[PDB]
Nucleic acid binder design. Structure first.
Lengths: 271, 46, 17
RNA sequence: AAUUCCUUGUCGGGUAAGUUCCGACCUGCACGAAUGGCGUAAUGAUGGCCAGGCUGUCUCCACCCGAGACUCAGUGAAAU
RNA sequence: GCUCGCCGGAAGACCAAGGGUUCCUGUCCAACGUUAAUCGGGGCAGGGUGAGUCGACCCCUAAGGCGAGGCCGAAAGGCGUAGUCGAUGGGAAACAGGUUAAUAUUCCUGUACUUGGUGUUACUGCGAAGGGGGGACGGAGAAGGCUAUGUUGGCCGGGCGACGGUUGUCCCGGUUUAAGCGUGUAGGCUGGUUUUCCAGGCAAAUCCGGAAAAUCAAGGCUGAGGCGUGAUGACGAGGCACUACGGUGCUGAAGCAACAAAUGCCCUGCUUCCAGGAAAAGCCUCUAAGCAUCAGGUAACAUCAAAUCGUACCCCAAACCGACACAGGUGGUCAGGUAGAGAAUACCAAGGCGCUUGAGAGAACUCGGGUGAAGGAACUAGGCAAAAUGGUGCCGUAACUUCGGGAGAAGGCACGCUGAUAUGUAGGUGAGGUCCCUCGCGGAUGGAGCUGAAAUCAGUCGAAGAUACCAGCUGGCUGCAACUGUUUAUUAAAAACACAGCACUGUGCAAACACGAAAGUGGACGUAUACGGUGUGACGCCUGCCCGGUGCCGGGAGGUUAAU
RNA sequence: AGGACCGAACCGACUAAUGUCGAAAAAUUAGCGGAUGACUUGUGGCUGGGGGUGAAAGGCCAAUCAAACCGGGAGAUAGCU
């Protein structure tokens, strides 16, 4: 649900919250937790490799099952939980044998639902099937690119891909970016689309909302000096230069895709 | 006025102590230069 | 009998411009 | 105009008197629509102007209370 | 020694960090102390630091470091696995009183507790770098139950008094006692027990998890305080006897109740919110290999061990950081009385101090302050600085607006003391007695006692009753930026920067991109509702025309065009 | 509930005065801003000089920063004093 707060005071005026009543109001499953120390954008050398990253509230990593290797074992959905790491919510799944796992929650998933994995599975949302068994023209999420890898495509909230073509041992996928990718058939995918589709409606409201979300202030190149940035300098907001990255690479319409290795799996580019 | 020098025995030893100097070769060269000069206090220590 | 070590920066002069 | 050389542009408001300020006109030296344009409640140790209250800011200072200055004893510098 | 003054959420009392004998006693005054000096944190000598329980060490781990092999690199060396280090965190145990010129939660007295080794006795299957449980966790907010602590009354001891009154509802002092053990309460959490089965817990499992039924509605866990014991002990005003006249020794009454009440405890609780809030070991429990006349384990008793290092003193300062015995800086704990909402402010207790040059005089002038005739910004770049406003309750409150605001708008009225309503009310707390009782730290009735607003009326004092301290100046028009926030440590705190939002663009994940000769890391244990870059900067109405030039993207006839 | 309001501790440093061989190599006194948050603080780590870090001032990096400090090339060079 989307609720807009009353303009009680500045900073709360523009906040738009996304309240999810069916979320679990309690501590998560301790056995599946794992510490996640923040890096602040620093790498092993200790230098800032990625800017505008730092701070934020402490958050624990949840071991989410992406491979879904428990084939032929029906499992019930215990509840849904808030995972700070993903944009989408996660679901606690209890298998018939009595083990609990975390999975991405699609739109149609809710407590008390039944899910299954492997070829011997129905077509209900949330089931894990290989594309060869999935009918063409359907919506799937958490797609794999190589068998057993785990799934990398369509993992964010409200994301999905289409089965557009089936060329024998290969399948063509149309991604939310308008990209048509050729993928090997045997590797797995999950039916339905990721839940929490209203992630756009949130606006964070104020400056500090981004601050405790792990994001640091961004400094425009113009405000910088000539030495530290290619932009900057001059009296009175002078630019007179083509936009560029801080390291001289020309941005704003310069393709940086140079792989020559995965191009054989690319059918069409973005448009 | 918080001056620059804020003493701390632990940090002083872990930054300029004997074991810190010997860990890396350059510190080893520093000890060698001190010995050649014949300084009474080779390094910092209690 | 140590000669003065720290000499402060001179007071800025009056602008004769 | 935070932009206007000419210039204290012209008219009105405010003052006994207004190169600032507010409103209008437009001969925009050289505003202008994301190096954003025009508005905008709230906010500001922010810029400019006006009124009430208030007073030594001032007309014009006067007196008083303390610490120095001054004298005595002791110690005893500095720039040049 | 007698007075005066100052601090009293500190200028008091205890610690860490950091100093390293500055501690105490004797002795000395050259130098040191901004003066003198018999004095000292100065010189010389002697003395002083006592731990199974405090801390370190030790067991475990975070960030991070190092790193066997390994990967990479002209060499040096870089990165990193198994590992091993790393408290700012987790893990066994002590309190009260007394004593030294100087140490004590360490010594002494009294009374306790914990972890191991060995032996004995009675039972028993034990057994891991392996599994599970536990350890184990956020912010904000509220209420209840308590304590530290304080006030008052009672009780005990003393006093009745140099200027009037004071045997009285008078005045002063005291009315203190822990850890541990027992009982276990208010509160909080969870439905218990039995049996069967199960590809999960990388092997196994009587454990965890899951699925089944039978049976009962109850147990279990956690838990401050209180009450007992500890303790007919200690402490204790005061009095007495000797003083190298500093003190020593002896004796020692009462030691209760009520009320108020925390920022402390119950509470790692509870209720809520999104930003979703360490790890590992000790500990509990189940098994593998292996051992089962053993070993090993459990319970009881006895005995032994608990080493080693720190322990003085300063610690908001004369002892640390500032070259100084420097108007500066420095984390944590305790923190009383009256007034007050308050850790503000004022005055005080405990306690500690008068800041290491003084004595005179009472000129200009400078500094920090007080007051002021009449005028009231005429000063000045400019109401700069000063003056003024200042609290509580009630009444009242504009334009504008994003409907929240603006707003404490503006502007008015009442504030002391005494009496009465009411020999202190409403309220709060609540004894004895009485009635029940799944019988006790229980439930009802009951109101003694104690505490205690606000309001009304009446009277009365003063020039002034928010009487001191404390404690907004207000309103109108307009520029800029939406706002909180950030910045030129040390002349610029702004219109600058950031900002939520918006748009463009790159990126299909071995992502783009960045740091690296490389390996490898970050991005991200993320993957297009995501990430990087760039510009703009809430919100409202919008964001027009131009592709020549310079960039970028796509195309390809022809020309030109390196190495070879 | 709140990057909410008034206001101490705490953090900051807007105005004025004093102080410039000062008590202090940016302080004191009287007012002032934030004060549940983009807050503040202790301890210990990481980033090393053509680099770091920077809510961006060429600011900060041991009282020094339009390229730190120390040693060396080095008795650099100086048509200049």
């Amino acid at each position: 649900a989307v609720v807009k707060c009353k303009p009680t005071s500045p900073g709360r005026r523009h906040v738009v919250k996304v309240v999810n009543p069916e979320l679990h109001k309690g501590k998560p499953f301790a056995p599946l937790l794992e510490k996640n120390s923040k890096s602040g954008g620093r790498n092993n050398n200790g230098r800032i490799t990625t800017r505008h990253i730092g701070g934020g509230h402490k958050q624990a990593y949840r071991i989410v099952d992406f491979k879904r290797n428990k084939d032929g074992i029906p499992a019930v959905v215990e509840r849904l939980e808030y995972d700070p790491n993903r944009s989408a919510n996660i679901a606690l799944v209890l298998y018939k044998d009595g083990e609990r796992r975390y999975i991405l929650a699609p739109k149609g998933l809710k407590a008390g639902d039944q899910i299954q994995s492997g070829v011997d599975a129905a077509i209900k949302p949330g089931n894990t099937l290989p594309m060869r068994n999935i009918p063409v023209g359907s919506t799937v999420h958490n797609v794999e690119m190589k068998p057993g890898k785990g799934g990398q495509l369509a993992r964010s909230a409200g994301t999905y891909v289409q089965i557009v073509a089936r060329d024998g041992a290969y399948v063509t996928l149309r991604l939310r970016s308008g990209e048509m990718r050729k993928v090997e058939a045997d590797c797995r995918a999950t039916l339905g689309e990721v839940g929490n589709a209203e992630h756009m409606l949130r606006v964070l409201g104020k400056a500090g909302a981004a601050r405790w979300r792990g994001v640091r202030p961004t400094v425009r190149g113009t405000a910088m000096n000539p030495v530290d940035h290619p932009h900057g300098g001059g009296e009175g907001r002078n630019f007179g230069k083509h936009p560029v990255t801080p390291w001289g690479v020309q941005t704003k319409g310069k393709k940086t895709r140079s792989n020559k290795r995965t191009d054989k799996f690319i059918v069409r580019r973005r448009s | 006025m918080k001056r620059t020098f804020q003493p701390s025995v632990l940090k002083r030893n872990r930054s300029h102590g004997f074991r810190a100097r010997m860990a890396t070769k350059n510190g080893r060269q520093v000890l060698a230069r001190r010995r050649a000069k014949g300084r009474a206090r080779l390094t910092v220590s209690k | 009998n140590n000669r003065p070590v720290y000499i402060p920066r001179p007071r800025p002069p009056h602008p004769r411009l």
